[PDB]
Amino acid sequence: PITGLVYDQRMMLHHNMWDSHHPELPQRISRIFSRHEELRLLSRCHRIPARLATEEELALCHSSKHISIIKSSEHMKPRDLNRLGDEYNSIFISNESYTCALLAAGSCFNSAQAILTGQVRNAVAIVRPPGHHAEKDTACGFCFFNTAALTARYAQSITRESLRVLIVDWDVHHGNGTQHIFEEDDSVLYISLHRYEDGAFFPNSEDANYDKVGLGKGRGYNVNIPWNGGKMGDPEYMAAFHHLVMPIAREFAPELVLVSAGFDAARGDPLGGFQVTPEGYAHLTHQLMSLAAGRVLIILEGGYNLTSISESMSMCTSMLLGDSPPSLDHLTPLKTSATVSINNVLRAHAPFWSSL
């Protein structure tokens, strides 16, 4: 019963040279690492090394053009870097960005390999830049390559092509990239909870609504749980897991669970406006550990309050290590709109999931 942990300080070299206080800070990953140290969680984990993804690995989800453009930024002067970054929605680029993104992806491949070969039971990946907004052909929302989507394909590449991978994306934003990449795929079940506001929240697309259930062979294998009109917190997320995430996941019977674990739904986050607590995140993790024979990989996505994300992700790792869930606060009655969101998803997915 071993928990893997990957962290490599080289991943802080990706930085914003015009706005050094941009919220996607290098010290996001070092602060999470430090909090694992001072909670004495780090020494309880088995350290998994980082590595670069290869270009061939990137091609599992991304076009050759996009790979070549981000790759070319390593040798760019600042004027090129600022101009290229401005070609995307919410991207900054430095000469180190490409390498950091390769390290983020490769760190997760190694963690997935360790899980799948039984060297560890589960694992946590403290990586940046994040991934779930990255599309097949473009960068977006602080993400260059879709680390979680790539890890699901990497996992299938070292097992069998049809390995059932569940991606739970509890970052406060919709994983537009992850949805698109697997939208026609029934071997990767994508479940995202996100602040939506009828499309008035980044990434600002109706693709995130509950009626997008997947396409072609993938119909039923895309589950959007969109939040509207309400500062959601632990009661709402517990309810979504009880009514939607856990029943669908158990029916799917994944062989590997990837968490796109953004922590910007956390209490205190400057962008998300939500109030999921560190103990809420522990319970969400503890619940996901009842799937896939405990084979869970927690991948850092967003989350921008350094104290909030450090405590929040440390508590997830505590659950991975087998610690008992901390007690939740008395769960207030669900915001009315949250009940409406859950009922809309239930109606959308009852046709495909008999457990609903």
Interface residues toward Zn ion, by CB under 5 A = 171, 173, 262, 264, 302
CB 220 within 8 A of CB 349: yes
Pick between residue 130 and residue 280 the one whose CB is nearest to ligand Z4I.
130
> Which region among 118-126, 144-152, 221-229, 233-241 touches K ion (by CB under 5 A)?
221-229
From the list K ion, ligand Z4I, Zn ion, none, partner contacted by residue 141 (C-beta under 5 to 8 A by kind): ligand Z4I
Q: What distance in Å separates the CA atoms of residue 18 and residue 15, rounded to the nearest whole number? A: 9
**Burial of residue 90 (number of CB atoms within 10 Å: 0-12, 13-18, 19+):** middle
- Position 221 contacts K ion (CB under 5 A): yes
What's the closest the beta carbon of residue 332 comes to Zn ion, in angstroms? 24
Check binding of 194 to K ion (CB under 5 A): yes
Q: Could you tell me if 29 and 14 are in contact, meaning their C-beta atoms sit under 8 angstroms apart?
A: no
Site membership for K ion, residue 138 (CB under 5 A): no
Token pair of 281 as six digits: 């995140």
Q: How far is the CB of 90 from K ion (least distance, A)?
A: 16
With CB cut-offs between 5 and 8 Å by kind, which of ligand Z4I, K ion, Zn ion, none does residue 318 bind?
none
Smallest gap from Cβ 320 to Zn ion, in A, equals: 22
| Rounded Cα–Cα distance for residues 114 and 180 (Å) | 27
Q: Are strands 256-261 and 296-300 parallel, antiparallel or unpaired?
A: parallel
Using rule CB under 5 A, residue 98 touches K ion: no
- The CB-of-92 to ligand Z4I minimum distance in angstroms stands at 9
Report whether 242 belongs to an annotated binding site.
Answer: no
Q: Which is nearer to ligand Z4I, 92 or 154 (CB)?
A: 92
CB-based burial of residue 23 (10 Å sphere; 0-12 exposed, 13-18 middle, 19+ buried)? middle
Q: How far is the CB of 346 from ligand Z4I (least distance, A)?
A: 26
Tell me if 230 sits within 8 A of 328, measured CB to CB. Answer: no
Of Zn ion, K ion, ligand Z4I, none, which one sits near residue 235, judging by CB under 5 to 8 A according to partner kind? none
Task: Read off the DSSP letter of residue 268.
Answer: T
Residues near ligand Z4I (CB under 6 A) are: 23-24, 90, 130, 132-133, 141-143, 171, 173, 202, 262, 264, 271, 301-302
DSSP reduced 3-state for 126? strand
Is 207 labelled a binding residue? no
Q: Is 218 in the site for K ion (CB under 5 A)?
A: yes
The set of residues, in sequence order, having a beta carbon less than 8 Å from that of 112 and lying 6+ positions away, is: 123, 151, 154, 155, 158, 256, 258, 297
- How near is the Cβ of 173 to Zn ion at its closest, in Å? 4
Which of 31, 33, 30, 38 has the alpha carbon at shortest distance from 5?
33
Nearer to Zn ion by Cβ, of 113 and 224: the residue is 224
- Residue 42: contacted member of ligand Z4I, K ion, Zn ion, none (CB under 5 to 8 Å, by partner type): none
- State which residue has the least CB distance to Zn ion: 302
Q: Which of 15, 36, 133, 349 is catalytic?
A: 133
173 is annotated as contributing to ligand binding: yes
Strands 165-169 and 256-261: parallel
Pair 108, 299: CB distance under 8 Å: yes
Q: How far apart are CA 56 and CA 124, in angstroms?
A: 24
Distance CA 218, CA 11 (A): 34
Query: Quick count: other Cβ atoms within 10 Å of Cβ 21?
Result: 6
Active site annotation includes 133: yes
- Residue 169 interface partner, choices Zn ion, ligand Z4I, K ion, none, CB cut-off 5-8 Å depending on type: K ion
What residues are annotated to the active site? 133
Binding residues for Zn(2+), as ranges, are 171, 173, 264
